[PDB]
Structure 1
């Protein structure tokens, strides 16, 4: 039973904010400064996730959490620690912006893992208790690594985002495959930022968000876009549809955003003017989707929509 709030009567938006936002407060843990990425999945009787909790030293750490309803979370006070047989890769430097999905027989976690700069760390868990670290998927610099929730043509597949070692002023989404969760390849460009005159919310850089959602018309990708104002970056988010069999081929891509920083909890915080989607839960029977997003890099919010309405919107307003 995924979380849901009906669209307010007369609301014409494709996505609408939970009235309970923020659903995770910045100070939920004794040492937490902010909690703003929630890589959430169903698990047994309820829900589990991997959360970015930055502490009062401003260090970036991952913590495991569980919930009955996916709204109110019990997050472990102590950061998640990985088992790894390779001491070189198993060394912890930092970790942020997790994504989690089940593939075939286990849950896989990706995150932005420090290894001589940002790259994509990979691990798996069967139980959300023990996490086994695998090879970093790519050479630095790379972030926004997001796996597909099944193999594509017999290979594991991941979206990523080549970066630099700062506040990156550019960013294309890429796609890569692996036969074995160790060696990666067949890299393909998915999409670049839009032109400023066409769609400025996504004209500086873009990055994948929640795990792709399979639909009959393609993979639904929810992704962030940045606009560079005189005063900083603004992070909004929107939607595209990727080919099912060859997901680096984009079928439709929204001109308008789905959500942008409007509420005080989105506009004021450690990083003002940020809505950064990190996970989603959905139900194909009803078309409901619940999107988790970080707010001002301070707290976590939830927003709701219908998959068919999102698909319609994405087609109707497509810039390709």
Structure 2
């Protein structure tokens, strides 16, 4: 059984009170390693999260934005004054959440949750893409249904694009010829009763290719709404088949800024990259800050 090791006992990205769009939270960040640089696309909130009302109410409205940060060493980031993606469309009125970025061939796809705020189910997986991590376009609703925790596989399987998603409460897979229409939906992984991952599970970042299969980091929620990270291995040629799944989590809330925050007891990753024979796992903590934790690639054994 292996676990992640935090690189720092302090957050590496925190909210910035002077910036409305990221005044209260930065968290759940996609990550791409390119040109010897860590590219973080982090969710940002202008407000705490009141979630216990019948419907989303203007008086408690929060807006998610996606900011960008970049780092050479993985620890110190250059940040920017404005977000790089905002919800401009009515179905994205309360913003854009939890991006996952996958490079397929020479294009980058960011899958995120657009939240329209018209009711608590007013969310959907959206996609934008770029060829430069800078000019995002091609917006589309990936599945026209309440769904989230979505990521593209970094390559095609038998000539088809592969989508991981999350019809409650399982991790699902789907296939597409054209990145518009999805078919061959299949459950690939389910929660487990009387465990830390009993309530629901969802993919973390997009799966990382290995020789022995696809490394699928995921998040699991217990009955107290504690979010932890677990890890599984998908079959290399049929990523719809799980060939190994670790029983214990690889990361759990332990530090004060993972236990305490806007949403207690959360570690949540939307991205991880392989660098120098190590896996770098960036994670939102308490839906308030971003941490980073690593595992030596050699220790990943099931």
Q: Normalization by structure 1: what TM-score?
A: 0.82
* 1:280, distance to aligned residue in structure 2 (A): 0.8
Deviations 1:184-232 (A, max 9, x none): 1111111110121xxx111110000011011121111000001113xxx
CA RMSD of aligned residues (A): 2.3
Query: Which of 36, 57, 62 is the aligned partner of 2:66?
Result: 62
Q: Distance in 2 between matches of 1:246 and 1:111?
A: 24
* 1:248, distance to aligned residue in structure 2 (A): 1.4
* 1:73, distance to aligned residue in structure 2 (A): 2.1
Query: Which of 171, 178, 183 is the aligned partner of 2:176?
Result: 178
Distance 1:83 1:265, change over 3 A: closer
Q: Distance in 1 between matches of 2:16 and 2:104?
A: 32
Report the equivalent of 1:168. Answer: none
* 1:144, distance to aligned residue in structure 2 (A): 0.3
Q: Distance in 2 between matches of 1:67 and 1:145?
A: 25
Q: Distance in 2 between matches of 1:47 and 1:15?
A: 18
Q: Does 1:94 align with 2:89?
A: no
Report the equivalent of 1:288. Answer: 278
* 1:64, distance to aligned residue in structure 2 (A): 2.6
Deviations 1:86-134 (A, max 9, x none): x888x65521000112110111100011367211101111223211033
- Contact 1:82–1:131 at 8 Å: present in 2 too? no
Q: What secondary structure, in the 3-state scheme, does the structure 1 residue paired with 2:142 have?
A: coil
Query: Which of 26, 43, 51 is the aligned partner of 2:15?
Result: 26
Q: What secondary structure, in the 3-state scheme, does the structure 1 residue paired with 2:196 have?
A: helix
- Contact 1:29–1:75 at 8 Å: present in 2 too? no
5 Å matches for 1:161-172? Answer: 161-163=166-168, 171-172=169-170
- Contact 1:82–1:133 at 8 Å: present in 2 too? no
- Contact 1:83–1:132 at 8 Å: present in 2 too? no
* 1:259, distance to aligned residue in structure 2 (A): 1.0
> Which deviates the most, 62-71 or 203-212?
62-71
- Contact 2:3–2:249 at 8 Å: present in 1 too? no
Distance 1:93 1:297, change over 3 A: closer
Q: Does 1:159 align with 2:160?
A: no
Q: What secondary structure, in the 3-state scheme, does the structure 2 residue paired with 1:130 have?
A: coil
Q: Distance in 2 between matches of 1:143 and 1:309?
A: 30
- Contact 1:82–1:132 at 8 Å: present in 2 too? no
Report the equivalent of 2:109. Answer: 108
- Contact 2:67–2:82 at 8 Å: present in 1 too? yes
> Which deviates the most, 46-55 or 137-146?
46-55
Q: Distance in 1 between matches of 2:281 and 2:17?
A: 20
Report the equivalent of 2:50. Answer: none
* 1:83, distance to aligned residue in structure 2 (A): 11
- Contact 1:29–1:77 at 8 Å: present in 2 too? no
Report the equivalent of 1:123. Answer: 128
> Which deviates the most, 18-27 or 201-210?
18-27
Distance 1:195 1:61, change over 3 A: same
> Which deviates the most, 296-305 or 39-48?
39-48
Q: Does 1:244 align with 2:242?
A: no
Report the equivalent of 1:40. Answer: 31
Q: Distance in 2 between matches of 1:15 and 1:140?
A: 34
Query: Which of 264, 269, 276 is the aligned partner of 1:272?
Result: 264
Structure 1 unaligned spans of 5+: 1-11, 164-170, 316-320
Q: Distance in 1 between matches of 2:205 and 2:85?
A: 23
- Contact 1:190–1:248 at 8 Å: present in 2 too? yes
> Which deviates the most, 247-256 or 64-73?
64-73
Distance 1:61 1:88, change over 3 A: closer
Q: Normalization by structure 2: what TM-score?
A: 0.87
**Count of aligned pairs:** 283
